[PDB]
Amino acid sequence: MLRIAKEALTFDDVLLVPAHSTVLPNTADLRTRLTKNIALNIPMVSASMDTVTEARLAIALAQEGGIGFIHKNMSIEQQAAQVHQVKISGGLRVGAAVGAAPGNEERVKALVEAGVDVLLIDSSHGHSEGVLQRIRETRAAYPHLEIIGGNVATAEGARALIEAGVSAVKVGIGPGSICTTRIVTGVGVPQITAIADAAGVANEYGIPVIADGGIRFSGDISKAIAAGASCVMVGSMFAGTEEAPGRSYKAYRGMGRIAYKGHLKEIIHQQMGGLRSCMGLTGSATVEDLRTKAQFVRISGA
Amino acid sequence: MLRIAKEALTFDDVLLVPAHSTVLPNTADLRTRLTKNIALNIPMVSASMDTVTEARLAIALAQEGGIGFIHKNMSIEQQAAQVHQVKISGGLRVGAAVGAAPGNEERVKALVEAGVDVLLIDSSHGHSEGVLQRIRETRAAYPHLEIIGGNVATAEGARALIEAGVSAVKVGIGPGSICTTRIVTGVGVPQITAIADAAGVANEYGIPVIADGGIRFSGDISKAIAAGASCVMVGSMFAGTEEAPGRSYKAYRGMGRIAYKGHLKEIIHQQMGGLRSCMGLTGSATVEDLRTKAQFVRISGA
Amino acid sequence: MLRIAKEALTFDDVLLVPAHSTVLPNTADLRTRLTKNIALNIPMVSASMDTVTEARLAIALAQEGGIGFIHKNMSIEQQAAQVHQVKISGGLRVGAAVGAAPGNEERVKALVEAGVDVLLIDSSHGHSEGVLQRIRETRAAYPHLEIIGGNVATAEGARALIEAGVSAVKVGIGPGSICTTRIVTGVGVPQITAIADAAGVANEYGIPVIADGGIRFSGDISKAIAAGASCVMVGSMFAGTEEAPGRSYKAYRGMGRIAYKGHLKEIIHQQMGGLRSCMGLTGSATVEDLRTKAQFVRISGA
Amino acid sequence: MLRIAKEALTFDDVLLVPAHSTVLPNTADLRTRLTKNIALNIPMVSASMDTVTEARLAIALAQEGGIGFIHKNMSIEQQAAQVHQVKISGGLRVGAAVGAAPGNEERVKALVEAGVDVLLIDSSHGHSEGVLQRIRETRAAYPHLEIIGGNVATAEGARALIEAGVSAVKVGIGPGSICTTRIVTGVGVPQITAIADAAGVANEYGIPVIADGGIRFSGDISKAIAAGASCVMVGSMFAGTEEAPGRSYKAYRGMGRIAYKGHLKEIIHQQMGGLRSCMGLTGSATVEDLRTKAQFVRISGA
Ligand SMILES: O=c1[nH]c(=O)c2[nH+]cn([C@@H]3O[C@H](COP(=O)(O)O)[C@@H](O)[C@H]3O)c2[nH]1
Ligand SMILES: O=c1[nH]c(=O)c2[nH+]cn([C@@H]3O[C@H](COP(=O)(O)O)[C@@H](O)[C@H]3O)c2[nH]1
Ligand SMILES: O=c1[nH]c(=O)c2[nH+]cn([C@@H]3O[C@H](COP(=O)(O)O)[C@@H](O)[C@H]3O)c2[nH]1
Ligand SMILES: O=c1[nH]c(=O)c2[nH+]cn([C@@H]3O[C@H](COP(=O)(O)O)[C@@H](O)[C@H]3O)c2[nH]1
Ligand SMILES: [Cl-]
Ligand SMILES: [Cl-]
Ligand SMILES: [Cl-]
Ligand SMILES: [Cl-]
Ligand SMILES: [Cl-]
Ligand SMILES: [Cl-]
Ligand SMILES: [Cl-]
Ligand SMILES: [Cl-]
């Protein structure tokens, strides 16, 4: 009667199962892929948000083995110069975001001319035909440009993005800490099922999946990876750091205030320490082992 | 052993699934049906409550494309005059409510003579034989009058109302924000299952279903429609507005105080903006697409 | 692997389903049975607790159509005299409780000689052999005495009580508002499943089931009856009334303080008004209709 | 798609079912086994934590019929002397913990020479090859030494420990009140399923299982035993007692403050009183009856 496609699971619905292990946390290999052709030293990227990622944060994150996505709420001169700034600070990679509306061609051109490593075409709805069309137009114009498209939350959405020409699929409709999509629209898919459904398709093509939204604790990063993600995208977790664009707070807002957190490097150290522990507990030598072989148990939340 | 008919779902048990879309929010078509023969420009109607709907609110809502139901807790002169007031403010439609007890014939006659577009026969229990009898008596007396009957929460209740002669079925036993039915009586059906069960029957006859109770957020409106409703009836959401009959509050009570909310037009704008977004995300060009083709996922609430 | 007998449901797991009805709340028939041979005008009895039932409350409740159980924490003279007090206030019925330990014979004799209508043999564990033995000894000694035995929470426990000679089975292990059994012992059965399992057996013999514990709201009374109970036993709900043995409170304690509630008659009126409403909504003309024909839906608690 | 091994249950997901009983709480037999060759008078052991167990607590617990595990965060002289202290206070048994890193041989030798009854090889991950290797090395060196290995949370982990030479398997990954494993790593198994899976294997060899972590209330002890554990290990429950190493608190920290609790003997008395009650309710004459024959119901947590 009611058209229910299936049950869907979020981070708090599952735990990872410990397994025989020869991995110690300090020996775990955190290397992974952002896109088909771009490797990362750690599985973390920053959100393309005007309170999270500008050049300073992008530099800090790349030095720690991640990549930042310069947000689009700035002029092209400003966004190209930020790209260039990162590129000259010693062979660092950088991304930049553009919207999916028509008229973005000059922004894309400037970013590409500035040496951007990866273009993110950011949308609240990656399965929208206008998004697919922007990706197809960009891929035709720039046959060798690494392109992330998103966000999707289904197998069919991931397949559509891949067939539009993306280099990586970004997943997340509903899960972000801002919570407006779900409440305002009634649309979303719990993020563990969303990642798995997208990865089920993406794996067939060797296309990485990026898990975007809902990461609160380092345990969520492990679960996101085990569900099939190659890396995670975080906004709230890095907002309020020194590097982000009677107590001290910084603005965090949807594209609210967050308590000051100090320097990004310590946050990243704590988060990856958790991941390293999980890899020791699950016997995962590499991110790929975690992503393809670790097992979950479903829990009640009692 | 225990006589359990089935499991039943409420709004918080489900999310809508994003889908391929050529719909933009500004292009979504919000037109729908209130009854077999009455169209609405937006899928919203107001509750027949003495703290929610009198002439002023009914006028404001009709100007925005909805319809109001003038409550019955007033004399006939008063209720007929309120009907007339709305009708003369420029070709606006209006409803009015009457109780299901015997002796309502003169009230119904006066409302009909005042030009009421739709008569609501309101009951806490639409599957009661006394209600069915009042609907049958009214339908026989006024063969062409649009009549809403309710409330029901089951397939069998919807079928009984239709067989009594209603023009639309109103659903909701248990879900209203007042919460007394469930707590006091132990009776109710979670509203997403209630809407779907009623729509399963009503669809066979082209009879609209009105989802009444439990709408807190614009996301609930989308879900109600996707479960099979043609429009939603709201009480709490409009109570406390300027138009409803050291902080400022208005009474909201069952047939309690609610913080002042300003003008109805802004509320309606925000609520329909959410619905338009959901339609963009689900690829629903029209209310009918959302109502008949969108899909849900079941969630745990973790 | 894990020895799980089945899933079990409490009051908050279920709702009653509305049904076709010719019953109005004021026409509902609240008569029921306490025991095989004792009728009640309403389905309520009071707990045998030293902060709930002495003669004054027992009188008030019997005048409203219920029956009270004089608690045992008093001497025999005191407990017999309390029995007699109720019996002389105009043809009122009364119960009295005794413990299940050996040595209760003189207490039982005195109660029987005082005219007690029903003897309650009260235990936290009715399936204990010592309890069954006390019931068997009492039944042999007093072949015509109405005897309630309890508490049990299973089919097998109900069958054992019946085979020991009880006139009614009292159900409840775990559900009481005091909550110590569950927390301290880890033992219990959710009360809706407990009632149904016990009634499944008891019905085969025409033996009533009394639902004891966990009743918070009048909705719980309806659900208890629909699960198979003939009446409900309440402690917290009547504790703190005028009649029970800078704000005003009375002691409520396990065999804590409760806010003063005024007179018992108003409480009973409100509780039975809820039940009458439920019977109108479910089309239950009599307690037996509710107990044997009404249907539930299972809910998530979202 | 998603690699989910199964659903898993914690203490709050289940209740024990009452059963026919000839057991009174005062007649229940609390004797059990710690290891293959070490009996206990009550099923309780203390955690090897630097805020829970040193000689004073170990003595007090052994006098009540349990055994304590002297923690390792002290020198060998200190840890051997603490062992000796307990051994001379009148034929008391004592355990001691060592880490699983290489270099522990002299610590183990000193503990064994001091008369330690049981060696605990403590790890957050008992299925780690380094742990299995330390157990195998210890078993080869000390063919007759009772050795506890842990912690594991799976059948396969329990089997690995047994095949490494342990005398008892300790279970718990994720359940401890400190909660860091789950949150930081995303790894864990709900403790009732973890105990049952481990006991399913261990039972085949007559090897006891020790349930470690998550015990808050005496009801949890009963459930842990019924799930298959022979005894429980507690940290938080004994931290803050007089004997543990403007209000009064003691440190409780992971290997935080806890309110002062008075003397250990009263805590143990209350906890075992709950267990005795559960055994009366379930008809379990002995710990083995509870561990192998009692039944659970699954509950929703409403
Ligand atoms: O519900 C939303 N309302 C918004 O206004 C919004 N803006 C961004 N995003 C998305 O949230 C992601 C970051 O989520 P977290 O704060 O949980 O890391 C981001 O990376 C986006 O995918 C939004 N989600
Ligand atoms: O539980 C209830 N006790 C009452 O006294 C009551 N009065 C009205 N209604 C119903 O609630 C609907 C409006 O519900 P919301 O405030 O959730 O919009 C209305 O449209 C009615 O269907 C009641 N429900
Ligand atoms: O957990 C418990 N600890 C106690 O000390 C206790 N004493 C009584 N009872 C039982 O609770 C019933 C009344 O429960 P309510 O307050 O929910 O009506 C009573 O009728 C009893 O069945 C107890 N339960
Ligand atoms: O999540 C954890 N973080 C820690 O730092 C930690 N240290 C000890 N343990 C384990 O917790 C057990 C005691 O748990 P309880 O306080 O629940 O009795 C102990 O017996 C250990 O198994 C830890 N768990
Ligand atoms: Cl999608
Ligand atoms: Cl989520
Ligand atoms: Cl109905
Ligand atoms: Cl609902
Ligand atoms: Cl029982
Ligand atoms: Cl219960
Ligand atoms: Cl394990
Ligand atoms: Cl747990």
Tab-separated table of N, CA, C and O in Angstrom, chain A residues 147-217:
chain	number	residue	atom	x	y	z
A	147	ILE	N	36.544	15.706	-11.644
A	147	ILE	CA	35.285	16.361	-11.308
A	147	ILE	C	34.590	15.498	-10.252
A	147	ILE	O	34.422	14.281	-10.431
A	148	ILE	N	34.193	16.139	-9.168
A	148	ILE	CA	33.311	15.503	-8.147
A	148	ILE	C	31.921	16.010	-8.402
A	148	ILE	O	31.669	17.192	-8.519
A	149	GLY	N	30.979	15.092	-8.478
A	149	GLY	CA	29.616	15.503	-8.548
A	149	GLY	C	28.837	14.994	-7.337
A	149	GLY	O	29.190	13.982	-6.699
A	150	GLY	N	27.772	15.703	-7.023
A	150	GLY	CA	26.918	15.254	-5.870
A	150	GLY	C	25.904	16.328	-5.596
A	150	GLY	O	25.880	17.348	-6.338
A	151	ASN	N	25.084	16.170	-4.561
A	151	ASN	CA	25.081	14.970	-3.698
A	151	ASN	C	23.942	14.041	-4.103
A	151	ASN	O	22.851	14.508	-4.470
A	152	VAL	N	24.189	12.765	-3.944
A	152	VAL	CA	23.173	11.734	-4.167
A	152	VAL	C	23.064	10.855	-2.935
A	152	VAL	O	23.923	10.919	-2.034
A	153	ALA	N	22.042	10.017	-2.934
A	153	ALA	CA	21.805	9.142	-1.774
A	153	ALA	C	21.286	7.796	-2.164
A	153	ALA	O	20.804	7.045	-1.300
A	154	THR	N	21.385	7.437	-3.450
A	154	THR	CA	20.816	6.224	-4.007
A	154	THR	C	21.760	5.601	-5.052
A	154	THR	O	22.659	6.299	-5.599
A	155	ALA	N	21.550	4.317	-5.323
A	155	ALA	CA	22.250	3.626	-6.404
A	155	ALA	C	22.035	4.328	-7.756
A	155	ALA	O	23.009	4.582	-8.484
A	156	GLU	N	20.790	4.671	-8.022
A	156	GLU	CA	20.420	5.262	-9.317
A	156	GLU	C	21.048	6.635	-9.482
A	156	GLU	O	21.477	7.005	-10.597
A	157	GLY	N	21.137	7.406	-8.404
A	157	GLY	CA	21.798	8.691	-8.438
A	157	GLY	C	23.283	8.557	-8.704
A	157	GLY	O	23.872	9.330	-9.474
A	158	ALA	N	23.927	7.641	-8.002
A	158	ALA	CA	25.358	7.378	-8.258
A	158	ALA	C	25.596	6.968	-9.741
A	158	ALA	O	26.571	7.455	-10.391
A	159	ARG	N	24.734	6.119	-10.269
A	159	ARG	CA	24.894	5.654	-11.645
A	159	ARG	C	24.726	6.798	-12.632
A	159	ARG	O	25.524	6.919	-13.589
A	160	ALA	N	23.749	7.640	-12.401
A	160	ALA	CA	23.547	8.833	-13.221
A	160	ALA	C	24.779	9.768	-13.228
A	160	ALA	O	25.175	10.285	-14.334
A	161	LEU	N	25.346	10.029	-12.052
A	161	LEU	CA	26.564	10.856	-11.958
A	161	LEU	C	27.706	10.251	-12.723
A	161	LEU	O	28.427	10.982	-13.456
A	162	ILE	N	27.902	8.938	-12.590
A	162	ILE	CA	28.985	8.293	-13.275
A	162	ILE	C	28.772	8.399	-14.795
A	162	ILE	O	29.752	8.664	-15.559
A	163	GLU	N	27.532	8.201	-15.224
A	163	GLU	CA	27.211	8.239	-16.648
A	163	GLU	C	27.284	9.686	-17.185
A	163	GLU	O	27.333	9.855	-18.438
A	164	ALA	N	27.303	10.699	-16.308
A	164	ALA	CA	27.485	12.088	-16.670
A	164	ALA	C	28.966	12.470	-16.777
A	164	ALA	O	29.311	13.519	-17.301
A	165	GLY	N	29.835	11.624	-16.247
A	165	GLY	CA	31.266	11.822	-16.386
A	165	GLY	C	32.045	12.143	-15.115
A	165	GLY	O	33.198	12.575	-15.204
A	166	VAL	N	31.489	11.880	-13.902
A	166	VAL	CA	32.216	12.322	-12.699
A	166	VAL	C	33.443	11.424	-12.463
A	166	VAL	O	33.474	10.311	-12.925
A	167	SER	N	34.395	11.943	-11.695
A	167	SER	CA	35.561	11.236	-11.255
A	167	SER	C	35.379	10.647	-9.837
A	167	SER	O	36.234	9.890	-9.376
A	168	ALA	N	34.322	11.088	-9.151
A	168	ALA	CA	34.004	10.634	-7.788
A	168	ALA	C	32.564	11.065	-7.549
A	168	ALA	O	32.093	12.081	-8.104
A	169	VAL	N	31.905	10.304	-6.700
A	169	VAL	CA	30.497	10.511	-6.332
A	169	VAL	C	30.414	10.962	-4.883
A	169	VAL	O	30.915	10.265	-3.984
A	170	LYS	N	29.756	12.076	-4.612
A	170	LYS	CA	29.610	12.533	-3.256
A	170	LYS	C	28.181	12.252	-2.752
A	170	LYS	O	27.210	12.514	-3.468
A	171	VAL	N	28.101	11.664	-1.548
A	171	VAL	CA	26.873	11.110	-0.990
A	171	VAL	C	26.493	11.876	0.213
A	171	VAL	O	27.288	12.051	1.118
A	172	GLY	N	25.217	12.242	0.256
A	172	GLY	CA	24.641	12.835	1.420
A	172	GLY	C	23.447	13.686	1.089
A	172	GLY	O	23.586	14.790	0.635
A	173	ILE	N	22.236	13.161	1.348
A	173	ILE	CA	21.013	13.962	1.241
A	173	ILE	C	20.273	13.694	2.537
A	173	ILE	O	19.801	12.579	2.765
A	174	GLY	N	20.229	14.711	3.386
A	174	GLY	CA	19.619	14.537	4.657
A	174	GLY	C	20.523	14.476	5.888
A	174	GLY	O	20.051	14.793	6.955
A	175	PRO	N	21.797	14.024	5.774
A	175	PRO	CA	22.522	13.684	7.010
A	175	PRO	C	23.234	14.862	7.702
A	175	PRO	O	23.686	14.716	8.821
A	176	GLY	N	23.392	16.002	7.037
A	176	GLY	CA	24.236	17.086	7.622
A	176	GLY	C	23.693	17.655	8.945
A	176	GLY	O	22.463	17.667	9.168
A	177	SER	N	24.612	18.121	9.813
A	177	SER	CA	24.292	18.584	11.168
A	177	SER	C	23.312	19.757	11.129
A	177	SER	O	22.642	20.031	12.116
A	178	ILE	N	23.205	20.428	9.977
A	178	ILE	CA	22.276	21.559	9.853
A	178	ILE	C	20.803	21.067	9.836
A	178	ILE	O	19.922	21.753	10.338
A	179	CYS	N	20.551	19.894	9.254
A	179	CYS	CA	19.249	19.182	9.399
A	179	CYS	C	18.050	19.807	8.736
A	179	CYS	O	16.910	19.420	9.043
A	180	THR	N	18.273	20.757	7.836
A	180	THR	CA	17.139	21.454	7.273
A	180	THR	C	16.503	20.602	6.181
A	180	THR	O	15.264	20.496	6.144
A	181	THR	N	17.304	19.919	5.359
A	181	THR	CA	16.709	19.120	4.286
A	181	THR	C	15.581	18.234	4.795
A	181	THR	O	14.413	18.325	4.296
A	182	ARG	N	15.907	17.409	5.790
A	182	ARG	CA	14.933	16.475	6.321
A	182	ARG	C	13.731	17.123	6.887
A	182	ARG	O	12.619	16.692	6.609
A	183	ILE	N	13.919	18.131	7.736
A	183	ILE	CA	12.832	18.747	8.439
A	183	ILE	C	11.941	19.598	7.517
A	183	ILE	O	10.712	19.565	7.620
A	184	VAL	N	12.570	20.374	6.672
A	184	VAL	CA	11.878	21.256	5.781
A	184	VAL	C	11.237	20.528	4.588
A	184	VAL	O	10.167	20.937	4.143
A	185	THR	N	11.893	19.497	4.077
A	185	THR	CA	11.471	18.878	2.819
A	185	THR	C	10.825	17.481	3.065
A	185	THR	O	10.039	17.030	2.231
A	186	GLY	N	11.232	16.829	4.135
A	186	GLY	CA	10.799	15.436	4.447
A	186	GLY	C	11.575	14.452	3.576
A	186	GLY	O	11.274	13.273	3.648
A	187	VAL	N	12.680	14.873	2.884
A	187	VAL	CA	13.461	14.033	2.028
A	187	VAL	C	14.818	13.686	2.671
A	187	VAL	O	15.454	14.561	3.264
A	188	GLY	N	15.246	12.445	2.544
A	188	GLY	CA	16.584	12.068	2.957
A	188	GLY	C	16.758	10.578	2.972
A	188	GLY	O	15.803	9.845	2.881
A	189	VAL	N	18.005	10.128	3.032
A	189	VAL	CA	18.316	8.743	3.242
A	189	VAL	C	19.395	8.635	4.295
A	189	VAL	O	20.463	9.238	4.135
A	190	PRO	N	19.139	7.847	5.370
A	190	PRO	CA	20.133	7.566	6.420
A	190	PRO	C	21.470	7.208	5.756
A	190	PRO	O	21.525	6.435	4.793
A	191	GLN	N	22.541	7.784	6.321
A	191	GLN	CA	23.809	7.874	5.574
A	191	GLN	C	24.532	6.551	5.390
A	191	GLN	O	25.233	6.380	4.388
A	192	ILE	N	24.419	5.582	6.315
A	192	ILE	CA	25.122	4.304	6.091
A	192	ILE	C	24.540	3.544	4.889
A	192	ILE	O	25.273	3.083	3.970
A	193	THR	N	23.210	3.503	4.784
A	193	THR	CA	22.561	2.871	3.614
A	193	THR	C	22.873	3.689	2.335
A	193	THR	O	23.137	3.091	1.307
A	194	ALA	N	22.842	5.000	2.436
A	194	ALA	CA	23.124	5.872	1.264
A	194	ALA	C	24.523	5.589	0.703
A	194	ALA	O	24.702	5.421	-0.528
A	195	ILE	N	25.518	5.537	1.592
A	195	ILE	CA	26.898	5.259	1.168
A	195	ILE	C	26.956	3.865	0.504
A	195	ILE	O	27.555	3.712	-0.558
A	196	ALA	N	26.413	2.845	1.179
A	196	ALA	CA	26.461	1.498	0.630
A	196	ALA	C	25.792	1.361	-0.728
A	196	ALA	O	26.293	0.650	-1.602
A	197	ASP	N	24.646	1.996	-0.913
A	197	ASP	CA	23.898	1.906	-2.191
A	197	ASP	C	24.741	2.581	-3.298
A	197	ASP	O	24.869	2.041	-4.394
A	198	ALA	N	25.302	3.758	-2.979
A	198	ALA	CA	26.150	4.474	-3.962
A	198	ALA	C	27.409	3.706	-4.272
A	198	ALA	O	27.804	3.564	-5.466
A	199	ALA	N	28.051	3.120	-3.251
A	199	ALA	CA	29.289	2.366	-3.446
A	199	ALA	C	29.061	1.081	-4.212
A	199	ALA	O	29.929	0.676	-5.003
A	200	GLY	N	27.890	0.490	-4.062
A	200	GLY	CA	27.558	-0.711	-4.774
A	200	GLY	C	27.686	-0.506	-6.289
A	200	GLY	O	28.153	-1.399	-7.032
A	201	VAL	N	27.221	0.632	-6.750
A	201	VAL	CA	27.369	1.058	-8.160
A	201	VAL	C	28.784	1.539	-8.452
A	201	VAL	O	29.421	1.028	-9.388
A	202	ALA	N	29.284	2.498	-7.678
A	202	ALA	CA	30.574	3.125	-7.955
A	202	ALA	C	31.737	2.134	-7.995
A	202	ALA	O	32.637	2.277	-8.844
A	203	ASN	N	31.681	1.118	-7.110
A	203	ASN	CA	32.729	0.115	-7.069
A	203	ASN	C	32.880	-0.567	-8.430
A	203	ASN	O	33.993	-0.997	-8.780
A	204	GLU	N	31.773	-0.704	-9.147
A	204	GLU	CA	31.798	-1.471	-10.437
A	204	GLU	C	32.666	-0.738	-11.450
A	204	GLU	O	33.105	-1.318	-12.453
A	205	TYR	N	32.853	0.570	-11.254
A	205	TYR	CA	33.615	1.406	-12.159
A	205	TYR	C	34.948	1.897	-11.611
A	205	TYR	O	35.639	2.664	-12.265
A	206	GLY	N	35.308	1.487	-10.396
A	206	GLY	CA	36.509	2.021	-9.712
A	206	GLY	C	36.426	3.482	-9.380
A	206	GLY	O	37.448	4.150	-9.283
A	207	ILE	N	35.210	3.983	-9.139
A	207	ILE	CA	34.979	5.399	-8.830
A	207	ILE	C	34.831	5.555	-7.314
A	207	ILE	O	33.965	4.892	-6.727
A	208	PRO	N	35.646	6.403	-6.708
A	208	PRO	CA	35.457	6.595	-5.261
A	208	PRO	C	34.182	7.279	-4.881
A	208	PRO	O	33.671	8.099	-5.618
A	209	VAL	N	33.688	6.936	-3.686
A	209	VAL	CA	32.582	7.618	-3.035
A	209	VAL	C	33.089	8.456	-1.853
A	209	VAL	O	33.910	7.988	-1.031
A	210	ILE	N	32.598	9.683	-1.747
A	210	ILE	CA	32.935	10.608	-0.662
A	210	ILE	C	31.684	10.733	0.221
A	210	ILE	O	30.587	11.061	-0.281
A	211	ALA	N	31.799	10.398	1.499
A	211	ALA	CA	30.717	10.501	2.410
A	211	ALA	C	30.621	11.901	3.039
A	211	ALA	O	31.495	12.295	3.790
A	212	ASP	N	29.583	12.649	2.697
A	212	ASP	CA	29.447	14.062	3.097
A	212	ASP	C	28.280	14.306	4.031
A	212	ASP	O	27.128	14.236	3.591
A	213	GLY	N	28.567	14.560	5.307
A	213	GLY	CA	27.503	14.986	6.250
A	213	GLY	C	27.301	13.983	7.352
A	213	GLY	O	27.313	12.762	7.166
A	214	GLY	N	27.078	14.503	8.541
A	214	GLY	CA	26.702	13.676	9.625
A	214	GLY	C	27.854	13.132	10.456
A	214	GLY	O	27.564	12.394	11.397
A	215	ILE	N	29.081	13.437	10.089
A	215	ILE	CA	30.247	12.977	10.846
A	215	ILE	C	30.391	13.860	12.101
A	215	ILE	O	30.709	15.013	11.993
A	216	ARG	N	30.189	13.257	13.263
A	216	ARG	CA	30.280	13.933	14.555
A	216	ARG	C	31.524	13.517	15.328
A	216	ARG	O	32.114	14.360	16.022
A	217	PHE	N	31.871	12.221	15.242
A	217	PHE	CA	32.917	11.576	16.055
A	217	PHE	C	33.780	10.748	15.133
A	217	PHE	O	33.361	10.356	14.013
